[PDB]
Amino acid sequence: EMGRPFIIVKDQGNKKRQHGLEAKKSHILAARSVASIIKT
Amino acid sequence: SLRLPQNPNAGLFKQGYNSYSNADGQIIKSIAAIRELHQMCLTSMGPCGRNKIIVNHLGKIIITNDAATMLRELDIVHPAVKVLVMATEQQKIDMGDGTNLVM
Amino acid sequence: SLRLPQNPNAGLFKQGYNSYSNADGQIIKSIAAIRELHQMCLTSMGPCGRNKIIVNHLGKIIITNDAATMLRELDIVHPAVKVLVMATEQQKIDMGDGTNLVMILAGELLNVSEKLISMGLSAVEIIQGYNMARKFTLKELDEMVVGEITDKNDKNELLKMIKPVISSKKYGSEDILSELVSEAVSHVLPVAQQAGEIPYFNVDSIRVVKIMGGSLSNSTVIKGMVFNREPEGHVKSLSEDKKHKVAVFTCPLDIANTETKGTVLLHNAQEMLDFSKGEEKQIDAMMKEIADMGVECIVAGAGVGELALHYLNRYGILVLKVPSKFELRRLCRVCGATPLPRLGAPTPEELGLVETVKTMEIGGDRVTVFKQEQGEISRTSTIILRGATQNNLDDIERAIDDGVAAVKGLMKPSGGKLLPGAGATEIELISRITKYGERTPGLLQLAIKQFAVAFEVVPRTLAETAGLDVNEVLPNLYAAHNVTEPGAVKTDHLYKGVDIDGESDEGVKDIREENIYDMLATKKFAINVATEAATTVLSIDQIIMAKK
Amino acid sequence: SLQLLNPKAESLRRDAALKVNVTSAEGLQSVLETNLGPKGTLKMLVDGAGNIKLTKDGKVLLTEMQIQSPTAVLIARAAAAQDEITGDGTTTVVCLVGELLRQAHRFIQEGVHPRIITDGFEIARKESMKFLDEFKISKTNLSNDREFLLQVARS
Amino acid sequence: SLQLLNPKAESLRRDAALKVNVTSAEGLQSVLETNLGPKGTLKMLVDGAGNIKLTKDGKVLLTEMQIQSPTAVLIARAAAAQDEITGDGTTTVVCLVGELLRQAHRFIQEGVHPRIITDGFEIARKESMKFLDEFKISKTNLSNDREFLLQVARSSLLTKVDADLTEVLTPIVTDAVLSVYDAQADNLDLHMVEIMQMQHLSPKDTTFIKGLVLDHGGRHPDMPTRVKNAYVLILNVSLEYEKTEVNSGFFYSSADQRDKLAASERKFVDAKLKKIIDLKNEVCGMDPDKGFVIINQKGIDPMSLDVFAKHNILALRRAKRRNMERLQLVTGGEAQNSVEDLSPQILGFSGLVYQETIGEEKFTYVTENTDPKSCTILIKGSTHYALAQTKDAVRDGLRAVANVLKDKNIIPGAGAFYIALSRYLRSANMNKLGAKGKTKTGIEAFAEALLVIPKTLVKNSGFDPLDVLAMVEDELDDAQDSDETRYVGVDLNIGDSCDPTIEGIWDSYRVLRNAITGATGIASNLLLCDELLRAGRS
Amino acid sequence: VVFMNASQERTTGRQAQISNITAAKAVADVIRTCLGPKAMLKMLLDPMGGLVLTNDGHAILREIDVAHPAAKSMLELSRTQDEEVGDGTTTVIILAGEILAQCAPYLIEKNIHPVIIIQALKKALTDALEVIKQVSKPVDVENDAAMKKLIQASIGTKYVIHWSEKMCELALDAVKTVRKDLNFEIDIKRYVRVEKIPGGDVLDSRVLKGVLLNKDVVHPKMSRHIENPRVVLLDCPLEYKKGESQTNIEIEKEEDWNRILQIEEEQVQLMCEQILAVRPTLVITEKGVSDLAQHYLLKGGCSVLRRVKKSDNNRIARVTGATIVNRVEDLKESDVGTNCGLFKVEMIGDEYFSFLDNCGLQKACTIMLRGGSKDILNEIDRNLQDAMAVARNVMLSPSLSPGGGATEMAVSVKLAEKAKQLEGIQQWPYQAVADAMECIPRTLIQNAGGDPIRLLSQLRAKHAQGNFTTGIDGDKGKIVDMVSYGIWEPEVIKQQSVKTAIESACLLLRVDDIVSGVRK
Amino acid sequence: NFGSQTPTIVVLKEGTDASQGKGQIISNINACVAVQEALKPTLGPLGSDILIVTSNQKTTISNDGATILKLLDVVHPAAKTLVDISRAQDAEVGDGTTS
């Protein structure tokens, strides 16, 4: 950090970033929650 | 012209100290201040005098027409009254009679 | 003992008012306050200078190394710094050249003044030392001038003037940026040699159009003005040639309306039936006289109604919108036309000539081509500037304006009066003022000798920004000036200067082959403004501020 | 006795008020003390709006900078009106008023009444007017001397 | 450049701090100038607790009132040191310091550097010390005349209370010395007189006593209050043991030893009492009108009070530390610690011993001595401040009459010494200069500043000080050519001059000598201080 | 995360060098008016309320709290000059502050590395010590008239110059009394006692050899005047001693409790008999004295003083020659103080004072200073310590150097001749010391009201004529030599001032970063 | 002289950042590399896409270097240079904005 604030994009702490296997697991479980609703 | 110079002596002594001097007040002014307590003793003088109820911060009530007893339980900020209060205290301690006449 | 008297009788003024005087080291703090913004412009000096980023309160970012432009967006607090800020802005307006020199020279005069004040020199004696040394400085500049521009326009001669000026601002490639500016200058010159007429030039004639995309090598020079516009009715390449006749109307095209309570009055149905067809015959009668004169293009200055645009598409007449004023004013200078407010038939003598009008895609939008050709020459040409980033497009626009302002310096004085560049101008003045300081008896020689020491910043800045040691390179340059002048004439040692990188060890032989020179008219006002800027700070014994 | 008339009020009288006129005029004269003379100091005024006023005129210093002390307000209005009609004398009146208060203040502490002190000011000033007639030098405009107008303008 | 070192640091340089030293000293002087002289104002000190103190002396005023201004702190510490050695001159030094600064500040605005101003102060002060030797008059104290001591002691009391109480206290402070003297040894101590604070009669009804008076009364009723012949036995040992040094306890096997172990502690008490009883009857037995009195510094066992009650012996406990030395001087006895060594030679003698009951406390009175070497002064008052106002008047009157015996030279008062220095310091000729025009600037500032003392006296009386001093200079001019030495004073009654020797006004030698030297150093350092800085860690 | 919790942001490069130079210059700028005989005074306000008014350099620095970390190193430089010598603390900061002021336009302008400058500062320091050694001349150290003019060097600046004629006689006999033959005189300030007595006159003073105690007598009968006093120092208190073992006595018989109090009285009488064996006239102890031991010593005429300061007992043993012995059983006639005389207690209303007069070469003296006020009396105390410190270096080495602007300019002239002969990268930093030595003589003119431009211009021309004795007058500002007026100062003062300034300049020029928040 | 405070004049208005030292130009490099970190996996036909939701809750899925930089609001001065070259490349040719 070197001691100075580093902000690339406005609302830095507001926005979140997902990547890797955790980003794929959240997308599959999001469809499984919708599927189990429609499957009934 | 909005703010006063505050005087140079404001920095001298402290802000809590108050001054009453000749031509600065007192001079029959403070004499008119003790008239409130003077009238208190005028109504208590004689066989027809009126007693006065005093409630101390502790809660004890002392009802008497004696000026030496009344001025003892009263907390008075005015300093020159204490000159008259301490004058009545000597009358009670030594002779014990005439405290109302002294005040 | 617990609390101070806190400056009694200070209630004479508001608590926000503060008093700062030359005593108690505040005049030293004022000089030290200059060094905060002085080092900012030191790294920006020369062709190797570094540009700076300044973000304003609105979010606009201007990346430039120009000292006059950077100080505009910055918020200045110290009062004497505003003296230095406003001094650099005047140099950019007047001569359009030498802006970084005024910023650096005025700052170094205060740095050498710190030692002068410490020795006990009064503020009056310090001012008299700079005034007497500046008068001798201006006289030596006219003695050291070499060469002249002579003829107004030349292909080679314009490379010795605009090119060294634009070398410091966005160096990049040399011949690419020099050819673009030098081409637009030859078009706005009236020429007309041997006629004895008084030459004339306009700095606002050349306009720079910023278009993102492409590359710098794809840029070109357009004799006409370029705007972003969309034709209303139709687009026409105008391949039928035989040039064109064009008219310009500063007033909009529409039925004349009463300025007070314009209202349709119909008493009976007989007047209502002819009201719809009546307005159609008014524009038809007015536009027919224009079409009969052979006018294929009409320039409008305001919004044009749809009823007027209908008959313009019938005869195949182009429509142009020119908002505000200055945009329309420079259009008539291209074609040589005189605007008239009425909608009637224009005068044939007031009609302009434009051979072709083209619409093509450059940066993704439709632009109209006013470009002229060899014959029927036009004035106020524009330069298309292509770049990847918009930040580079802003300073190059100001870099071209620096070359345009250099052309103005070829008009008012008797000539160009080229001076040795690469810092050789300020170095030669050091040895001349040093001899001048000894010729003046008295105590005023202290400020005169230190006045020439302030000129050492130019060779040190060019050497420091070039990645070279100022201790090795600078003393080696005085070896050419320490041998004075020999028993024979024709001494070329005056062309020695500071070199950037390369092999160092002085170098570049004589700068006469390098062709980089300086303008004499620029150095005259650059020294005067920088001296008065430092003199004003030294002439103020007490500074008073409000609210802070 | 003012505390009985108003709940909250501020007043200073006699020796408290005597230090008001003497000290406030002393701080104002000290600002223009370094101003008087061709070698005098140069002052710059910068307000909160960003404007810059650089001049040696004492009238600009009084108009741009506010004064909380009411004593200098009487002096500021007197020094400003002097430059209005005569175009000169702004810093002169301030040095006269501020010093005359201090020169007469030493005898006030000695017990001398202020009225008989101010009564001597009129007697001494009327003599300056009678001496002014013999002090002034007559100049005839029929000569049309240009050198005379040059030396006066350089003052 | 100070804020660069610390953000919270503040300073005032050159004239910024110079205006502080002139104003703060003038403001402090303006309050205390009204207290100078017999007509001066009376200040009432009231703290947050409600205590009332009436005094015209600047020592008590500056002590009770804390000074916020750092400049006036130097004046307060200088006036405090003036009251320590000389017991007088608090108001005088304060009026001189503020005047030396104002007179010198007028030359500073004229372009005079403070360095040469301090030179004129030291040169003119040394010349005043030489004139002080010629102006003072030596007196003969071998006669011990009352009239000379009454006028000198009255001059100090006129600056405290009115003339009614002054005439009462004048013989008291004159009698404050009396039998205390030494021809060869020169040692004179005023700490042998005792200051008693009690409310009895009236403040004007107080009287002087020729013998020691104590505040402790008879502990037992049978103890005779009046004793015609008493032998004072000084006992510094405590008859009642407070604690035992080595920790110990009593372990008894049977209940019969409980009264025996209690009687074990009765042997040590009776061992000290055995030799005391034998000392009384040793002189003569069965002798009426001759009593025996013991004065103990420590506590006395209430159980032992009945032992002396049968023998009619008066006992006193909890005596002050300074009381032991006074018993040898008054009663003529000798201080004794234990009872192991006794004799009639070490016992004191008193012609009258009696006790009076005032309020709920009883006071012991001892008087009628042959050659008493010490005495006391009873200060009575009608209120709380009457004890503090009279005490401050006596203590300031003690040091005045002491310098008469310490220094036989007496300097006339009533501002006669300050006026004489005015004409002497005007022109020093070629005697002492040191520089051309540099030294004469500081001398003129110091000469005109010494006239504030006589002018301040007139301002408190309500007259014109310029008209009073005008007739003073006219008398001194004709006295030089008439071959007659005259001392011109200042009379505050009719607003005219007078003679301090005839009017009975004089001043002490150490008071005036330390005032000129003390006020010179304070005013000089303030003129040499161009910056007032405050820094530290909170 | 935040990584470093202490100053994660950093200020490095030229920004850290400017903050170190600017803050160091502000330390010397406030004391510029504190140099010279016309120098002004500075008042300081501590959080406790005590006011300190002095022109001394060290007393001003140590009482001011500086928030700038590198500027605090300037505060401790005067402590090095004060503890080692005690004179010249003002000239150290003025010189060290001018070096960094002159060395500033190098790293920013010439871009010269600090170590390159440090190598030039060390070479200039060696040449500066040689110039000071050449201009120094030896003088007689046993001449009393010559040492009086040397003490006046530091007095001319101080306010005590009016009493300088009297003050030199006070400081001369004080140093000569405590010094002894052995590292030569090995004199120490701890042996010299300076007592501050409020009131009195400064013109009237005397050097008293002994210890002045403010304690009164323990008994009225005690004789306050003794013709032939005998002092015996005892560290053990005369009160009954109690064992630290916390002994608990179990009392059974009725005669056991009465015997304990008797034995306590017998031992106190026994300890007095051990003292009376040598029959001392005086008794001095550092602890309390019981009332029982007072009567037993009345028969022998032993005056007892209690609660004496611990360091005062060592000073009594030097003047009286007595040997400190804790136990009364080892007391001998050899341990009794001898040669002491003139024991008298003067009566003063404030406190009781006891006098001692002397007739193993180490001695002590107590200087009684009588001022006009307690705060001025604190100034004379500080002025007396600096006056005696000048005579120390004179007795240590015979070398004596000129002062008042002659020594500072004598070095700058020699540095100008060698600078042009170097012809190298070190030539620029070598010239910084030559211009740094000019601040001290230039400050003397600015405080005197003269023109430093014309005086310093002709001053350098005088030193080129071959005479090093040309100074600058503090009053008239004349160029007359210092031999006529007689300003001379020990070489140690000139050496310690130059050595400290060079070592301090190399420290702050090596700081490229300033970080905080550590909280160790 | 008008007060015992005597404030120290600051050259720049309060709130202005600092510069020079060591690592100031390095701060601009790490800002562009971090933006590059998102566009690297989007390169190539087998590359991935980036899901970006603005403050208006507008879902947009783009691997294009020009569109990604238009969604986010870049307040970093040096990081905005990558936005200009992405919009300039998309305006003329239209392809290669990620490269």
From Swiss-Prot, chain A:
Highest taxon above the source species: Eukaryota
Subcellular location: Cytoplasm
Family per record: Belongs to the TCP-1 chaperonin family.
Oligomeric form and interacting partners: Heterooligomeric complex of about 850 to 900 kDa that forms two stacked rings, 12 to 16 nm in diameter.
Function: Molecular chaperone; assists the folding of proteins upon ATP hydrolysis. Known to play a role, in vitro, in the folding of actin and tubulin. In yeast may play a role in mitotic spindle formation.
Name under which the protein is recorded: T-complex protein 1 subunit epsilon
Gene: CCT5
Residues of the full protein shown: 24 to 63 of 562
UniProtKB/Swiss-Prot annotation, chain C:
Gene Ontology molecular function: ATP binding; ATP hydrolysis activity; ATP-dependent protein folding chaperone; unfolded protein binding
Record location of the Glycyl lysine isopeptide (Lys-Gly) (interchain with G-Cter in ubiquitin) cross-link: K14
Modification Phosphoserine occurs at: S504
Keyword list, A-Z: ATP-binding, Chaperone, Cytoplasm, Isopeptide bond, Nucleotide-binding, Phosphoprotein, Ubl conjugation
Major localization listed first in the record, in broad terms: cytoplasm
UniProt keyword Magnesium present: no
Record-linked Gene3D superfamilies: GroEL, GroEL-like equatorial domain, TCP-1-like chaperonin intermediate domain
GO biological process: one example: protein folding
Compartments where found: Cytoplasm
Assembly and interaction partners: Heterooligomeric complex of about 850 to 900 kDa that forms two stacked rings, 12 to 16 nm in diameter.
Protein family: Belongs to the TCP-1 chaperonin family.
Name recorded for this polypeptide: T-complex protein 1 subunit theta
Organism this protein belongs to: Saccharomyces cerevisiae (strain ATCC 204508 / S288c)
Curated annotation (Swiss-Prot), chain D:
Record-listed N-acetylserine modification sites: S1
UniProt superkingdom: Eukaryota
Subcellular location: Cytoplasm
Subunit structure: Heterooligomeric complex of about 850 to 900 kDa that forms two stacked rings, 12 to 16 nm in diameter.
Family: Belongs to the TCP-1 chaperonin family.
Entry function: Molecular chaperone; assists the folding of proteins upon ATP hydrolysis. Known to play a role, in vitro, in the folding of actin and tubulin. In yeast may play a role in mitotic spindle formation.
Name of this chain's protein: T-complex protein 1 subunit zeta
Section of the entire sequence shown: 2 to 156 of 546
Swiss-Prot record, chain F:
Gene3D superfamilies xref list: GroEL, GroEL-like equatorial domain, TCP-1-like chaperonin intermediate domain
GO terms of biological process kind: chaperone mediated protein folding independent of cofactor; protein folding
GO cellular component terms, semicolon-separated: chaperonin-containing T-complex
Annotated positions of the Phosphoserine modification: S245
Disulfide bond found in the keyword field: yes
Record's keyword terms, sorted: Acetylation, ATP-binding, Chaperone, Cytoplasm, Disulfide bond, Nucleotide-binding, Phosphoprotein
Family the UniProt entry places it in: Belongs to the TCP-1 chaperonin family.
NCBIfam families attached to this UniProt entry: chap_CCT_gamma, thermosome_alpha, thermosome_beta
Name of the protein in its database record: T-complex protein 1 subunit gamma
Organism this protein belongs to: Saccharomyces cerevisiae (strain ATCC 204508 / S288c) (Baker's yeast)
